[PDB]
DNA sequence: CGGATGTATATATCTGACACGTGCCTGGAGACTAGGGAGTAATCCCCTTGGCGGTTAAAACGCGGGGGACAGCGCGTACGTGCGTTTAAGCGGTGCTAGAGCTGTCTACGACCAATTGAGCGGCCTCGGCA
DNA sequence: TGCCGAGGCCGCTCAATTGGTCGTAGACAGCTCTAGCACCGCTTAAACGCACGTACGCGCTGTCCCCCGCGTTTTAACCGCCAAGGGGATTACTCCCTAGTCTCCAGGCACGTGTCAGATATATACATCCGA
């Protein structure tokens, strides 16, 4: 469905500015898109597995929190 | 039968000793739980909470504000070294980052 | 009926800063923090008891778990707080 | 007009002071559903679930960029590059 | 108020 | 008495490579590996049972914990092995 | 009593099912343990063990040896991609490393 | 016991670097390596001694060392 | 006869990436371990296998760190490793 | 001889 | 091309660790009963999805220019290679006792159950901290 | 200049507290014997110190091309409002699956033993490097 192109170049620039970066080469955007896709696939697979084990049709914030904690990425503020 | 006195006030704490005891008993940790374990655990939890809240309130006052927000929590945690070591792999939602620019990039 | 630590966190906040509020998002974050620390300490104590072939979790296991998990000066002041509460609770039976 | 670098420093200072999310919510949600399509069909999502995913992703990317900056400064450059990103990820272990 | 000896 | 997995590891080795032996250091390493994997899987299953307010650990939780722990192609074949063994066991009583 | 039949023989396995059942029951994991869980766990452990041993035997044969040693085990694990992912934070004693020289250091 | 960090000599550090795949080494590497090693060893030994003290023992054991290493995500195989 | 600089180094890399023995001397390492441990508790005894476990862990850790340091050095178009390479590698790893 | 179909 | 220098090859040989066989004892299998955990069945209402219109914040695009990345060159110093000399690691016996491991008794402590009731949660209402 | 969410006020149910009983986990004491510490003498292997030279960090210069800052036009994100139903969540009820006991009995563990895989040297054929 080609929805990765919705992560636009100015958004990546804003993230890099929050990261303290001052100058950005023109090939960084495609690399960033690939890295983000890998990370998102890794998290969503585990979230869906938890949802399926509960015999549910709806993914929940606690599913997402458990999946994140499983990878050593604990997150506060969503239950 | 006499007047019921809570174990929290008996130990001089604010955290719920009985609730801590029930969680320990029900959490599949060991076959049996001793009597002083909930008291010790509640004391430690209360101490850590007090430390974090004092630092966060200091940050809130430094921002000329009355209410504590996640930004103040994040600032306190990341500015305290031991707390930063303890909460090393934790993300605080709506927290932000510490202001920091490398010296080489400055004009 | 959902139970949380909100009232106890608020009591500690009133003790520390008498004139200062807290928003609901920050209270949720504090709830997450308390639950996380509880889980870490309880797991460490359970591992210790299993290692030493015991079937009980006592205050000695909690004290050793705190030393293993908290860094530097945080452990020293936490161990002193826990010891004081146990000896005060025992005196009044 | 300003010299190249002044506006960048001002933007760094501006974006290191706030806490709002920097990606657009609707495109991010579309991407999330597209990815979830491959693991199970006819899946529903909670708004808080999507929000948690977005917060985690943004924190991860910001951390990666701050590591890439160090890698770029090590090689006596100012511009970040795909080789810097690859080195940071290789050392991190991903 | 309640203070800390660590700080 | 010190129980170990040595005889079972040796049987599996005999049925994989008939004319091949193993030294005691390698056997110790294999014992460590078996214990480590058992602990990982059991811990994940215990967490899964707790998250859903269940009191028992069944083979449905073991299967889900295997899908969370093993990499892509390893998990697919491990699930096939576990399902086949339970079916054969069930049609034996 | 119509003679004792091993639970491992009923499932067609080599790993012990009764011992796995006892370990699950004594390990403080849950209140109750179902009947097919030990069978499933034993099957998974046996599958993984066979997977490692085949590669180790191949490495030993390539080394012109009869017996498997930790060096062979380490070579097998580090050369298999998925096993390397599974055991990526594990140190094997007396295992050594994989031979690898960067291309730019060569003459 | 004093000044035992100098027993980790320059040829030994060179052998470790050679196994690591390094071809050239500057002269300031050895002091840095000694400092890094001392920090790592102190971190492991503190936890091992805590495990030994909880059991009311006077002898540190291989199981204590293995538990201390596993507590930090450095699992070791081959010692029990 | 005299070899050119680098030939012996490559031969040494090839030799030491093939074997599995420990590369540090046992008695000095044991002295160092006891000296470090004397600061946490006095009159401590050690089992024989505990010291060996400590040595294996230390050597594996240092070899991996050197592997990362070499990549950091190569990233800057160099062949020699320097203290700043170790510092960058440890900072990225999170130590 | 037992062999793995994954390989 | 040619020589000195490490590489792998095939001889023998000997030793100590691996693989196998035995006696027994403790943990696993068989059979039975009892209770509650979980599996269906059914209903309520919360919240997720889908659509429409407007407004305006953000994205997309083109242009000009300067500053940063990259290649090339020269130089001096610091690291690698090799040799002679000094040190202390490794090995093999011997002695000694500190402490880890095991066994037996017997109390103090924790699980369990019944009866009360006050702590804590849900629902409302207001005003002042904050954008 | 507000407007909405933080804090404070009741009703009420349920989970924490008090009191008593029972059984076993663990604390203490005594005994055994293994292994961790300490020492001594001998070989020789490795650490150490020195000298020479070369190759590689490192600074300096020059060229160009590619990112940045800015003005303009197009796009769709966002926000408010509305409607419909899939499914999350709860309650009732029954049965079947797991825990707990008591007999039996054989699978696995400690122990002893006897050969063969694989470490050691020696002589040898052969790549390999470097300066001619």
Numbering used by the authors:
A (entry chain F): 23 to 101
B (entry chain C), G (entry chain G): 11 to 117
C (entry chain D), F (entry chain H): 30 to 122
D (entry chain E): 40 to 133
E (entry chain L): 375 to 381
H (entry chain B): 22 to 101
I (entry chain A): 39 to 133
J (entry chain K): 374 to 380
Sentences from the paper on this structure:
The proper control of mitosis depends on the ubiquitin-mediated degradation of the right mitotic regulator at the right time. This is effected by the Anaphase Promoting Complex/Cyclosome (APC/C) ubiquitin ligase that is regulated by the Spindle Assembly Checkpoint (SAC). The SAC prevents the APC/C from recognising Cyclin B1, the essential anaphase and cytokinesis inhibitor, until all chromosomes are attached to the spindle. Moreover, we have identified the molecular mechanism promoting this localised interaction: we found that a loop on APC3 and the N-terminus of Cyclin B1 both contain distinct nucleosome-binding motifs that regulate chromatin localisation. We conclude that nucleosomes facilitate the interaction between Cyclin B1 and the APC/C to promote the rapid degradation of Cyclin B1 during metaphase and safeguard genomic stability.
In addition to the expected crosslinks within the APC/C-CDC20 complex and within the NCP, we identified two crosslinks from the APC/C to the NCP: K390 from the APC3 unstructured loop crosslinked to residues 96 and 106 of H2A and H2B, respectively, which are proximal to the acidic patch of the nucleosome. To refine this analysis, we expressed and purified the APC3 unstructured loop in baculovirus and found that this was sufficient to shift the NCP in an EMSA. K390 lies proximal to arginine residues that conform to an arginine anchor motif that is used by several proteins to bind to the nucleosome acidic patch, and mutating them to glutamic acid (APC3 loop3R3E) abolished nucleosome binding in our EMSA assay. To visualise the interaction surfaces between APC3 and the NCP, we determined the cryo-electron microscopy (cryo-EM) structure of the APC3 loop–NCP complex at 2.5 Å resolution. The excellent quality of the map allowed unambiguous ab initio model building of APC3 loop residues 375–381 (containing the sequence PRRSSRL) that bind the NCP acidic patch. R380 of the APC3 loop is the arginine anchor that directly interacts with acidic patch residues D90 and E92. To the N-terminus, the peptide forms a saddle on top of H2A helix α3, thereby reaching H2B helix α1 where Q44 and E56 of H2A both interact with APC3 R376. The interaction is stabilised further by H2A E64 that interacts with the peptide backbone of the APC3 loop. We conclude that the APC/C binds the nucleosome through an arginine anchor motif in the APC3 loop that engages the nucleosome on a surface encompassing the acidic patch. Serine 379 is within the APC3 loop arginine anchor motif and phosphorylation here could interfere with binding to the acidic patch.
